[PDB]
């Protein structure tokens, strides 16, 4: 509760299930080695977006054929 | 009681009045939530458990 | 050719107006094609300031059994029609607009009139029936379009009802759409009295250029955010009402079909009962495809955002 | 004698003010009633301001801390009232809002009071900042507020476990509803530093009044404060994610205009 009230993390607590549901949280520092992971994560997101874009185009072509 | 149930008619109707007020208090108590034990209601109403079950 | 409908052939229109095929059949005109421009302008006029009872003229042409509306415009109404009819300085304005259009290009003449019904449904009242009957006397054809600005919010979409009257004394041979509409207590009386004195045209929108333009603009500025949950259809009042209305329509169809089996040789019943079955099926199909499109946008986005990588 | 409305208004106002320090509500309530009855007849603006101040004082005194806060806030944005008197009225509004029953109306009043800079001037500025910005309340802020209120508690004392502590528990349960999806009796009581029976009773009272949403199960001892199914939680998270994307993109463009030039060069090259 101290961390949440200082506007660090936003979320909800489930005591019956003993779970901490965090809707939003701040990030950490990135200077030396996490950049490669970020680039890999960004590349995966870019590839995934392109795959969905190609998939939408294929469905549009299929709809035109129908 | 010397001026509340002293009248035989009010003496007859006091049971119904108590039943009605207990019903109202019970309904008000059980409105906000669900799945409540009976002995707690009996202690809150200051009556027997069987009366709570009947009500 | 998407833009073929925009070509105006004056001689062809004169030929059709000289032929007058509508005199040979009172059900001659069956379809009403409305431009995206005219739809938008009429809905925008109808909405005006919340729920205002307004009216205007429609410019367009005829093509076989189809009436085509290309444009629309309004008339001056000093003191909210303080005189008879919503016209006041109408003739002058109309003529000026016509000549101005003929110069700048618009060569389409009067094809009908439109007016709004704020929150009472798309139908023709006794006044509107008499108006469209007089509009069938002068200006031979003419069509009465009715809009609902308040039902564009309530129902969510709402169609622009297009109607044509029957001549005095003439009976619809069997025409019975059995279409249910919610009409206020102070309006349902008049509605039921003059409902059979006219018929509804099939309203359709040619996929032109004006329509897709608006679709792009909205989904590129305001509806660019395709989140908003994914289903406002979840609120089960519009679908459930359509589902319940569909149930009632087919239940009445079965009741008529069951009674129609004892009568051998009633051709009118057959056509009308099958017409009801067809209309009810389309309403279910349109509702079905709307929900399917709702989940399709849901699935693609939800799958992407959650577990893309 | 047919006394003019101003004289009757002044007399009833004086009686009402006298009764506030003699501590006798019944008759002063009736006198405020009659002063309001003849109030919409008078003319003097300063007399009307004095009447409104006295009426807000009466509302603060009886139990109407929320209505007193509303009246004091309405009177705070005035001109003829002395700046010192305006600040005092705003301080009374703030203290009433803090002491008010913690609900939607109190939340709206707290949000409204988080705008005045003379609110920031006051010593309770931090207090309502904590209230509105959402936090849990300990027992150390009690002393200063209690001292400020009326060298004890506002209105005429409290003795209802202190109205200060009633409001503290109410706002603590509100903050719990903000975070805790559900909570057990013992842990909730430990959080509120009260016995579990007191915690469950106060939670049930808040739910009955509509100031805290949820339901209580007595078998397992678990009070399910809030459960937003699965769609509203997911939609807000995506919306927050997209908003943070937009905030980032604006920050790079503003703080690093060279990136915007680089972005234009990159998009033109490809
Ligand atoms: Zn009408």
Q: How many other C-beta atoms are found inside a 10 Å radius of the C-beta of residue D156?
A: 14
How does DSSP classify residue D64?
A: -
Give the C-alpha separation, D134 to D68, whole Å: 23
CA distances D38 to D17, D32, D67, Å, are 17, 10, 21
What are the residue ranges of helices labelled H in chain D? 5-22, 25-37, 45-62, 65-76, 83-99, 104-113, 117-121, 125-133, 142-149, 163-179, 185-192, 196-209, 231-255, 257-269
Q: How many other C-beta atoms are found inside a 10 Å radius of the C-beta of residue C7?
A: 8
Q: C140: closest CA among C7, C5, C26? A: C26
What kind and span of H or E run contains C200? strand C198-200
Query: How many residue contacts between A and C have a Cβ separation below 8 Å?
Result: 13
Give the distance (Å) from ligand 1 centre to CA of residue C118: 10
Contact A41 C300 (CB under 8 A): no
For residue B28, list chain D residues with Cβ-Cβ distance below 8 A.
208
Chains D and B contact (Cβ–Cβ under 8 Å for 3 or more pairs): yes
Q: How many other C-beta atoms are found inside a 10 Å radius of the C-beta of residue D190?
A: 13
Residues 6+ apart with CB under 8 A from C147: C42, C43, C46, C114, C115, C116, C117, C122, C158, C160
Instruction: Classify C82 as helix, strand or coil.
Output: coil
Check if the beta carbon of residue B33 is closer than 8 Å to that of residue D217.
yes
Instruction: Classify C116 as helix, strand or coil.
Output: strand
Q: D148 is written with which tokens? A: 């400020």
Give the C-alpha separation, D12 to D101, whole Å: 30
Give the C-alpha separation, D175 to C135, whole Å: 68
Burial B19-34 (b: 16+ CB within 10 A, else e): eeebeeebeebeebbe
Chains B and C contact (Cβ–Cβ under 8 Å for 3 or more pairs): no
Contact D184 A4 (CB under 8 A): no
Give the distance (Å) from ligand 1 centre to CA of residue C194: 12
Rg (CA), chain D: 25
Give the distance (Å) from ligand 1 centre to CA of residue C135: 14
Q: C213 is written with which tokens? A: 């333009």
Q: What is the dihedral of CA C84, C87, C89, C94, to 10 degrees?
A: -150
In angstroms, what is the resolution? 7.5
Give the C-alpha separation, B32 to D201, whole Å: 11
Query: Which phi and psi (to 5°) does residue D55 adopt?
Result: -65, -40
Rg (CA), chain C: 22
Contact B34 D217 (CB under 8 A): yes
Instruction: Classify C62 as helix, strand or coil.
Output: strand
What kind and span of H or E run contains C12? helix C10-19
Q: Is D242 on the interface with C (CB under 8 A)?
A: yes
Check if the beta carbon of residue C144 is closer than 8 Å to that of residue C131.
yes
Residues 6+ apart with CB under 8 A from D17: D54, D57
Which residues of C contribute to the annotated binding site for Zn(2+)? Answer: 115, 117, 128
Q: C202 is written with which tokens? A: 């099939």
Check if the beta carbon of residue D35 is closer than 8 Å to that of residue D48.
no
Nearest CA in chain C to D239: C227
What are the residue ranges of helices labelled H in C62-209? 90-104, 126-137, 149-154, 185-194
CA atoms within 13 Å, Cβ hemisphere of C15? 6
Give the C-alpha separation, D237 to D243, whole Å: 10
Q: Which residues have their alpha-adjacent CB atom under 5 A from ion ligand 1?
A: C 125, 128
| Sign of the dihedral defined by the CA atoms of residues D250, D256, D260, D263, in that order | negative
Query: Which phi and psi (to 5°) does residue C81 adopt?
Result: 50, 65
CA distances A12 to A19, D175, D176, D225, Å, are 9, 11, 9, 11
Check if the beta carbon of residue D213 is closer than 8 Å to that of residue D182.
no
Q: A53 is written with which tokens? A: 């874009």
Q: Residue D23: is it exposed, middle or buried by C-beta count within 10 angstroms (0-12/13-18/19+)? A: exposed
Q: Is D183 on the interface with A (CB under 8 A)?
A: yes
Query: Which phi and psi (to 5°) does residue B19 adopt?
Result: -60, -45
What kind and span of H or E run contains D224? strand D222-224
Give the C-alpha separation, C144 to C132, whole Å: 6
Residues 6+ apart with CB under 8 A from D219: B35, B37
Residues 6+ apart with CB under 8 A from D197: none
Query: How many residue contacts between C and D have a Cβ separation below 8 Å?
Result: 10
Q: Terminal CA-to-CA distance of chain B, rounded, Å?
A: 25
Check if the beta carbon of residue C34 is closer than 8 Å to that of residue C70.
no
Chains A and B contact (Cβ–Cβ under 8 Å for 3 or more pairs): no
Nearest CA in chain D to B32: D208
Give the C-alpha separation, C47 to C51, whole Å: 6
Give the C-alpha separation, C263 to C86, whole Å: 50
Give the C-alpha separation, D202 to D189, whole Å: 11
Check if the beta carbon of residue D76 is closer than 8 Å to that of residue D89.
yes
C65: left (phi over 0), alpha (psi -120 to 50) or beta: alpha
Instruction: Classify D54 as helix, strand or coil.
Output: helix
Give the distance (Å) from ligand 1 centre to CA of residue C129: 8
Give the C-alpha separation, A2 to A24, whole Å: 15
Give the C-alpha separation, D111 to D116, whole Å: 10
Q: C14 is written with which tokens? A: 């004169």
Give the C-alpha separation, C139 to A44, whole Å: 66
Rg (CA), chain A: 20
How does DSSP classify residue D218?
A: T
Check if the beta carbon of residue C8 is closer than 8 Å to that of residue C70.
no
How does DSSP classify residue C259?
A: H
Q: C149 is written with which tokens? A: 């600005």
Which residue in this structure is represented by tokens 């699935």?
C299
For residue A41, list chain C residues with Cβ-Cβ distance below 8 A.
309
| Sign of the dihedral defined by the CA atoms of residues C155, C158, C164, C170, in that order | negative
Give the C-alpha separation, A18 to A24, whole Å: 19
Check if the beta carbon of residue C178 is closer than 8 Å to that of residue C148.
no
Give the C-alpha separation, D18 to D16, whole Å: 5
Give the C-alpha separation, A61 to C153, whole Å: 34
CA distances D220 to A17, D206, D214, Å, are 13, 20, 15
* Domain of C148, in residue numbers: 1-206
Burial D207-234 (b: 16+ CB within 10 A, else e): beeebbebbbbbeebbbbbeeeeeeeeb
Q: C71: closest CA among C30, C114, C20? A: C114
For residue D231, list chain C residues with Cβ-Cβ distance below 8 A.
229
Q: Report long-range pairs for B30-37 (Cβ below 8 Å, ≥24 apart).
A: B31/D208, B32/D204, B32/D207, B32/D208, B32/D215, B32/D216, B33/D204, B33/D207, B33/D215, B33/D216, B33/D217, B33/D218, B34/D215, B34/D216, B34/D217, B35/D217, B35/D218, B35/D219, B36/D216, B36/D218, B37/D218, B37/D219
- C-alpha D266: how far from chain center: 52
Q: C255 is written with which tokens? A: 């009741």
What are the residue ranges of helices labelled H in C57-148? 90-104, 126-137
Contact D242 C227 (CB under 8 A): yes
Burial C104-134 (b: 16+ CB within 10 A, else e): eeeebbebbbbbbbbebbbbbbeebbebbbe
For residue A1, list chain D residues with Cβ-Cβ distance below 8 A.
135-136, 175, 179
Contact C308 A44 (CB under 8 A): yes
Give the C-alpha separation, C271 to D32, whole Å: 78
- Residues of B in CB contact (< 8 Å) with D are 28-29, 31-37, 40
Give the C-alpha separation, C133 to C164, whole Å: 8
Contact A15 D183 (CB under 8 A): yes
């Amino acid at each position: 509760i101290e961390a949440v009230y200082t506007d660090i993390i936003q979320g909800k607590l489930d005591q019956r299930n003993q779970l901490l549901e965090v809707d939003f949280c701040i990030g950490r520092d990135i200077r030396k080695k996490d950049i490669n992971n970020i680039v890999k994560t960004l590349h995966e997101w870019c590839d995934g977006c392109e795959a969905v874009l190609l998939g939408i185009e294929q469905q549009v072509l299929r709809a035109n054929q129908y | 009681h010397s001026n509340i149930m002293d009248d035989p008619f009010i003496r007859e109707h006091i049971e119904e009045l108590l039943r009605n007020i207990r019903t109202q208090v019970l309904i008000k108590l059980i409105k906000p939530y669900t799945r409540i034990h009976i002995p707690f209601i009996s202690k809150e109403l200051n009556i027997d458990v069987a009366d709570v079950e009947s009500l | 050719s998407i833009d073929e409908i925009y070509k105006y052939d004056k001689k062809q229109q004169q030929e059709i107006l000289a032929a007058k095929p509508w005199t040979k059949d009172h059900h001659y005109f069956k379809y009403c094609k409305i431009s995206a421009l005219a739809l938008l302008k009429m809905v925008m006029h109808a909405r005006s300031g919340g729920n205002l009872e307004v009216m205007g003229l429609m410019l367009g042409k005829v093509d076989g059994e189809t009436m085509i509306i290309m444009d629309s415009f309004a008339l001056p109404v000093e003191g909210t029609e303080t005189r008879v009819n919503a016209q006041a300085a109408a003739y002058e304005y109309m003529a000026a607009y016509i000549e101005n259009a003929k110069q700048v290009g618009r060569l389409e003449n009067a094809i009908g009139w439109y007016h709004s019904h704020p929150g009472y449904g798309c139908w023709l009242s006794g006044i509107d029936v008499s108006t469209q009957m007089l509009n069938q006397q002068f200006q031979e054809p003419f069509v009465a379009v009715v809009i609902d600005p308040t039902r564009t919010i309530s129902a969510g979409k709402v169609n622009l009802g297009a109607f044509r009257t029957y001549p005095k004394g003439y009976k619809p041979p069997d025409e019975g759409p059995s279409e249910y509409q919610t009409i206020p207590l102070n309006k349902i009386e008049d509605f039921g009295v003059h409902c059979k004195q006219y018929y509804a045209l099939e309203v359709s929108y040619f996929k032109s250029s004006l329509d897709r333009k608006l679709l792009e603009l909205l989904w590129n500025k305001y509806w660019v955010n395709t989140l908003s949950s994914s289903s406002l259809l979840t609120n089960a009042d519009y679908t459930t009402g359509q589902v319940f209305d569909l149930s009632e329509k087919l239940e009445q169809s079965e009741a008529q079909l069951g009674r129609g089996s004892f009568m051998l040789g009633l051709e009118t019943h057959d056509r009308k009962s099958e017409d009801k079955l067809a209309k009810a099926t389309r309403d279910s199909c349109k509702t079905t495809i709307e929900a399917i499109h709702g989940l399709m946008s849901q699935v693609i986005k939800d799958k992407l955002f959650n577990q893309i990588n | 004698k047919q006394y003019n409305v101003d004289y009757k208004l002044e007399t009833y106002l004086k009686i009402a003010r006298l009764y506030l320090e003699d501590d006798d509500p019944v008759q002063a309530e009736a006198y405020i009633n009659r002063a309001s009855l003849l109030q919409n007849e008078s003319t003097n603006e300063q007399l009307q301001i004095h009447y409104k101040v006295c009426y807000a004082r009466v509302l603060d005194y009886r139990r109407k801390f929320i209505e007193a806060a509303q009246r004091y806030n309405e009177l705070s944005y005035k001109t003829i009232v002395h700046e010192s008197e305006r600040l005092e009225a705003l301080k009374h509004a703030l203290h009433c809002t803090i002491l008010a029953s913690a609900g939607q109306q109190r939340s709206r009043m707290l949000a409204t009071l988080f705008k005045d800079e003379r609110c920031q001037q006051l010593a309770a500025y931090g207090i309502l900042e904590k209230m509105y910005l959402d936090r849990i309340i300990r027992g150390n802020q009690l002393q200063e507020f209690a001292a400020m209120l009326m060298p004890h508690q506002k209105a005429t004392t409290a003795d209802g476990s202190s109205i200060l502590d009633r409001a503290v528990i109410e706002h603590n349960l509100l903050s719990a509803s903000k975070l805790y999806n559900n909570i057990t009796f013992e842990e909730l009581g430990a959080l509120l530093e009260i016995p579990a029976a007191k915690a469950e009773k106060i939670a049930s009272q808040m739910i009955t009044e509509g100031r805290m949403n949820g339901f209580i199960d007595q078998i397992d001892g678990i009070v399910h404060f809030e459960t937003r199914e699965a769609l509203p939680t997911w939609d807000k998270q995506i919306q927050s994610l997209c908003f943070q994307v937009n905030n980032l993109l604006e920050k790079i463009s503003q703080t690093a205009p060279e990136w915007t030039a680089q972005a234009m060069e990159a998009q033109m090259a490809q």
